[PDB]
Amino acid sequence: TKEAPETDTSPSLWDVEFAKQLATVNEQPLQNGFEELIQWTKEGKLWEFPINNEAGFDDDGSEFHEHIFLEKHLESFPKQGPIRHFMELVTCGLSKNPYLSVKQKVEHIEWFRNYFNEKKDILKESNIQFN
Amino acid sequence: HYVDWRMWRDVKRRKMAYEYADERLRINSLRKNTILPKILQDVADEEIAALPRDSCPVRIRNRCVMTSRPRGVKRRWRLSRIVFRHLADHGQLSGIQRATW
Amino acid sequence: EEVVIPKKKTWDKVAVLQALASTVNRDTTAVPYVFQDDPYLMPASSLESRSFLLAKKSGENVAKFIINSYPKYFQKDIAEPHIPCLMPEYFEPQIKDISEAALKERIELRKVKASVDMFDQLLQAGTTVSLETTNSLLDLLCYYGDQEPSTDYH
Amino acid sequence: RPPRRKALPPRTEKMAVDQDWPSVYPVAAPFKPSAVPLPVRMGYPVKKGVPMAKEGNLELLKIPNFLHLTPVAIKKHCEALKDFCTEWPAALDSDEKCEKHFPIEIDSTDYVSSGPSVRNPRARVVVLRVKLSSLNLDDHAKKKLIKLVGERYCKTTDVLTIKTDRCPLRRQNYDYAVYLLTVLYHESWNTEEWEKSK
Amino acid sequence: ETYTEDFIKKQIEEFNIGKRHLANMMGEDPETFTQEDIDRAIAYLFPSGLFEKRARPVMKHPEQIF
Amino acid sequence: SLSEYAFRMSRLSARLFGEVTRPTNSKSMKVVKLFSELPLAKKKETYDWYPNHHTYAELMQTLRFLGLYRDEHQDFMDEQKRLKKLRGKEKPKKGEGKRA
Amino acid sequence: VDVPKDLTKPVVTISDEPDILYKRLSVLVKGHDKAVLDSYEYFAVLAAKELGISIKVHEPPRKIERFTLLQSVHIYKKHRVQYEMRTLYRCLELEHLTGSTADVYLEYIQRNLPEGVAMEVTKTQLEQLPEHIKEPIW
Amino acid sequence: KNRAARVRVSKGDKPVTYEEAHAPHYIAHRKGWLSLHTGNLDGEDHAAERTVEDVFLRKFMWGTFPGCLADQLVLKRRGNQLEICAVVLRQLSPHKYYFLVGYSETLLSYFYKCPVRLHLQTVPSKVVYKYL
Ligand SMILES: [Mg+2]
Ligand SMILES: [Mg+2]
């Protein structure tokens, strides 16, 4: 038999429709209540058991160190002074937030980076040098 | 199609408060510390004060979702005492019964 | 000392239901499961057996017609995990520009007339239409014969 | 006027007393008087009256019945589910033997509720328990480890409890609990120069 | 409501047939199936937490019921 | 009120357990709390407090016009409004009120 | 007479990966009706015995939450109606079962969880020490 | 005098069902609950959402099966399944009941994003518990 299949063969209308004629030959009404649950489970309507409260929710495949170690995102900020102390509290709080994705946590940090850039003049008056 | 105009105003307050939550949280963080300069915190005070009044979460009122009654509401079911009792007394609230002891 | 941990067993998400289903047989006092198990609603003849299911399917079609006609009423998704098969279907093309990538949309939706019209206009303008797309247009016309596939209601 | 429709006799009248009942109620289903061949009555009776019959009885409809879980059905169900199970190691006869070979305990909780959303924020929590006796800790390391963990360590039981719930997922809180156990173990073995001032 | 003697006679025929059905459901011998087993089987199959026992599901001999 | 050993042992545990490492007063610790939780306005109980009354009213109104839902209340209102016209108590045209 | 001749059995594949070991499964069910928990206890315990799982059962103390509401729509403050929600508990404690056995048993008893009954299953997994922790690098 | 959910005495001619004949203090004593779900158990969430859904389903079914319902609905939730159990009359033709079952199950499944099933029990007439 054909040894290497055409995995990337396109689904032409002729091939998609013929596959529907092969699903009609085994099309029969549900015989009992177990078959209705099986059908709902295949269709995705019924929860899969045993129950997993995280079913269908992976947080973008993020690892734990992406949520808890956020100092790699403060490289654009000053290394010392009040702006560093303030951002260590923000990242400390974001590292304890299980209701935010890594994407949303970075957005918070990026907002402060831009906010402090617009306030460079005000910060220079106070002897703080943000970039 | 909300119960009344007062429920409609709270719906808008909840929608606007949700839209400005992140912005208000970030500005407030600048005001809620003794680390940053006062010159910077004084500017943050003005910025959060300039945001729309209906973005402020203290203006949200927990009204009955079926009658818009602003008081006598049970938070767990979001119903006024009158509406809650109507359902409870007809056996339509799972597990809820009259208490005698 | 050493302990031998047993090897893990794996099965499909429906395997347990399929095992439980194997333990039961057809109930001979009952009509097929598709019918309402009620003496007044159970089919009493081969004619009612056919017509009762057609009436139930008609009700499903009326609901789907309404769901797809007024999708904004059925767009609030409170299900976790998401159920793609319980959302409204959108049968209209959302690309209104005249180009090849907009024709491919009308071909996937199987719009024979719109795809032909979009193909003519695209051709008169003199823009190049790829071969793969031209064939994908023939597969649609050659299958349905330059006729529109059946729909629920226009 | 055409003839009105006659309801058929209840199919309980066709059931044999030696039938396979699990086939009648294979899955959880509401009480059906026409299908349950029992003269069961429910309802507080009126004075010099009987409890209401099953036909049209809403009180019997309100009950989460177990007609689909008769002892005959449960025993047949489990005979088919034996092929899905694996054998517990015989060597692990007692809890003390499990602790010897498996010193770490990982606790997680799953929550089954009724509704459209399976999500529950309590499910992310992970609890890791280990006994410091199980770890290769010298006198200095055990003393430093106990000070670092603080109240996480219980002297009575000698068990270190690390509860992690700061990540969105349980797999992340599990990897973080193992990470904490690893950095605590290696820092306990490191000796700083300020420690000489104890 | 007055229950004619013929009605009670047919209510007893239903209880005896249902008694064998209930015994078959629980996989027990229909001959040695007692009223205590009936009450136990009905409490399992139709669990009711109603505080008043008189309002709970019951499958008793018509003599006892009516 | 801590020895140098205890102060540095507590600062080391904070580093390992991802706590605040710099000395921070109670006022500045509110920043940590603010970003450790969702704001009240972002909680689902807050922004989804009400059911979408537009959806429910519009859906059932549409189902009534389709003949698949009988709104007894609306039918009652329609009969009262019908009998008020025969009684002469009809709603005026906007701009054509009794005051003109 | 009209019986199936041969039955297709669900495919259970034995893997090459070792199975999870659960020291304990604590299945805590909560409900408003004690009789429903009694029937579920009987079902769950009988299911465990047939599968060869060691199971113990006990009943944690019930919780009754009471609250007071005004009886009248307007005034009459001294007249109240009091309501309660009763939460009753049953705890199935299973021991020394593999991860595959826990998946089958929990799926079987979770699918048959009566309406109005919630379940909190706490699973205690046995793990070996991470390899990095076995010896000090220093 | 208490009024809540009390069918008041008449001249002995008003037929009441078992549910209608029992005042609220008999709830959990002589009568059960018309909806069963986990939202009102201690430590459980989403009681507010389950309650709104129940109020809608009762109104939806009242107007979808007009004149057909012979008693209050019984609402059961297991997992993500929603079961609606209704006692109906035997006046509508069986074809109309199958149309409405197919229609209602489909529409409610898409509205609340869960598999919804409707279980109908027919009675020749409203079951009378007593004549008040
Ligand atoms: Mg307020
Ligand atoms: Mg009074």
Under a CB-based contact definition with an 8 Å cutoff, are residues C58 and C153 in contact? no
Q: Which residues of F touch A (CB under 8 A)?
A: 18-22, 24, 28-29, 31-38
B57 CA from centroid of ligand 1 (Å)? 9
Q: Which residues contact B98 (CB under 8 A, 6 or more apart)?
A: G81, G82, G83, G84, H24, H25, H27, H28
**Count of positions (residues) in chain F:** 100
Mutation target to probe the H interface, by most H beta carbons within 10 A, among E1, E48, E50, E54 is E50
Q: Which of F45, F56, F70 sits opposite H56 (nearest CB)?
A: F56
Residues whose CB falls within 8 Å of the CB of residue G37, separated by 6 or more in sequence, listed in order: G29, G31, G88, G89, G90, G117
Burial, D171: exposed, middle or buried (Cβ in 10 Å; 0-12, 13-18, 19+)?
Answer: middle
List, in order, residues 6 or more apart from B52 with CB less than 8 Å away: B16, B20
Q: Alpha carbon E50 to chain centroid distance? A: 18
Q: Give me the DSSP letters along D92-136.
A: --SHHHHHHH--EEEEEEEEE--SSB---GGGG-EEEEEEGGGS-
- Under a CB-based contact definition with an 8 Å cutoff, are residues C22 and D81 in contact? no
Separation of G20 CA from ligand 2 center, angstroms? 61
Alpha-carbon distance values, B48 to B18, B41, B65, F29, F30 (Å): 15, 11, 30, 20, 17
Tokens of H66: 């007009």
**Tokens matching residue H88:** 């109906």
CB-nearest to C8 from G10, G100, G111 is G100
Long-range contacts of range F8-12, CB-CB < 8 Å, 24 or more positions apart? Answer: F8/D192, F8/D194, F9/D144, F9/D147, F9/D148, F12/D148, F12/D187
| DSSP type of residue D165 | -
| Residues comprising chain E, all counted | 66
Which burial class, exposed, middle or buried, applies to D134 when counting CB atoms under 10 A from its CB (0-12, 13-18, 19+)?
A: middle
Residue B38 has which token pair? 């006062």
* Burial (CB count within 10 angstroms: exposed 0-12, middle 13-18, buried 19+), residue H56: middle
**CA gap F39, F35 in Å, rounded:** 8
Cis peptide before C81 (omega within 30 of 0): yes
The residue whose two tokens read 């205890």 is: F6
Q: Do C63 and H107 touch (CB under 8 A)?
A: yes
B57 vs B16: CA distance, rounded Å: 9
Give residue for tokens 């036909």: D55
Q: Name D110's bridge partners.
A: G121
Q: Tokens standing for A117?
A: 């850039």
Instruction: Give the closest residue to H48 by CA, choosing from D122, B87, G70.
Output: B87
* Residue-wise burial string across C74-87, b where 16 or more C-beta atoms lie within 10 A, e elsewhere: beeeebbbebeebb
The b-or-e profile of G62-77 (16+ CB within 10 A means b, else e) is eeeeeeebbbeeeeee
Residue window 93-112, chain A: list those with CB within 8 Å of chain B: 107-108, 111-112
**Residue D167, SS3 per DSSP:** coil
User: What six digits make up the tokens of H50?
Assistant: 């389950």
What is the distance in angstroms between the Cα of D141 and the nearest Cα belonging to chain A?
Answer: 26
CA B58, distance to chain mean position in Å, is 7
Name the DSSP letter for residue C74. Answer: G
Q: E35-45 vs G34-51: helix axis angle to the nearest 10?
A: 100
Using CA atoms, how far apart are residues C149 and C109, in angstroms rounded to an integer?
A: 10
Determine contact: H74 vs chain A, CB below 8 A.
Answer: no
Residue A90: helix, strand or coil by DSSP?
helix
Residue A64, helix vs strand vs coil: helix
What resolution (Å)?
A: 2.8
* G88 close to G37: Cβ distance less than 8 angstroms: yes
> Peptide bond before A50: cis, by omega within 30 degrees of 0?
yes
Among D83, D104, D92, D91, smallest CA distance to G96 is for D92
Distance CA B14, CA B61 (A): 9
Contact H81 A46 (CB under 8 A): yes
User: Could you tell me which chain D residue has the CA closest to the CA of F7?
Assistant: D194
CA distances from D105 to D175, G23, G84, G128 (A): 14, 8, 38, 9
**Cα F56 to the chain's mean position, in Å?**
16
Structure tokens at D72: 């005959």
Q: How far is the CA of B70 from the centre of ligand 1 (A)?
A: 10
Experimental method: cryo-EM
Distance CA(G40)–CA(F75), nearest Å, equals: 47
D41 secondary structure, DSSP code: B
Q: What is the rounded CA–CA span in Å between residue C10 and residue C138?
A: 45
Q: Do β-strands H81-89 and H116-123 pair in parallel, antiparallel, or remain unpaired?
A: parallel
Nearest in space to H115 (alpha carbons), one of A41, G116, C63, A45: A45
Residue type, D72: V
Specify the amino acid at residue H13: D
> Which tokens sit at A115?
């906010």
Residue F44: how many other CB atoms lie within 10 Å: 11
- How far apart, in whole angstroms, are the C-alpha atoms of residue C105 and residue C115? 9
Cα distance between residue C38 and residue A63, in whole Å: 54
Q: Which residue type sits at C6?
A: P
Q: Rounded to the nearest whole angstrom, what is the distance from the C-alpha of residue H44 to the centroid of ligand 1?
A: 25
Q: What's the one-letter identity of residue D80?
A: A
- What's the token pair of residue A63? 């690892």
Amino acid type, A127: N
Q: What burial class does residue H101 get, using C-beta atoms within 10 Å of its C-beta: 0-12 exposed, 13-18 middle, 19+ buried? A: buried
**Phi and psi (nearest 5°) for F92?**
-75, 165
CB contact under 8 A, H77 and G118: no
3-class DSSP assignment, residue A72 = helix
